[PDB]
């Protein structure tokens, strides 16, 4: 599990392991490098989702890694309060962006290996703080450089603190 430490409050997230190996690897290596630390969600459409994890504060986009391949072909749909990584329109460019769908966005779904077809591929779902999520996807957006629907006030991540549980069979 990740907690997203938010000044709206904790968003509280179990990720999807065996279904977007690469893509959970990809996101716990940011969380750990401290990547999210002091970034927004700069891009918030009430009805749609909720993404940030690629700039701080005056919209500075940090420098990412390479890009991920799409782990999308898994089967896992966009339904609300799943995580999925954001990407330009090359499927397997995503870096560390990721958004919150806050209903379910089936056009988002993968359908098939092209451009058209890949979609976005969920890897994680919220598991305490949708209240934050709902919260966050209400807040007021306008206008920054070229950019839409960035909050008018930041919405930050503070900081990712990472959870794990390891079992013992006696």
Known sequence: ??????????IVIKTFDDKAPE????????????????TIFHRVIN??????????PGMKQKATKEPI???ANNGLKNTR????MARTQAPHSATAQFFINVVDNDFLNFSGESLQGWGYCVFAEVVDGMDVVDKIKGVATGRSGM??????????IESVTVSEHHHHHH
């Open 1 to 10: 599990m990740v907690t997203f430490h938010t000044n709206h409050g904790d």
């Open 23 to 38: 893509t959970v690897k990809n996101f716990l290596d940011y969380c750990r490098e401290g990547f999210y630390n002091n």
């Open 47 to 56: 009805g749609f989702m909720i993404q940030g994890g690629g700039f701080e």
């Open 69 to 71: 391949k799409n782990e």
């Open 81 to 84: 309060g799943t995580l999925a």
């Open 147 to 156: 950019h839409q629907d960035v909050p008018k006030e930041d919405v930050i």
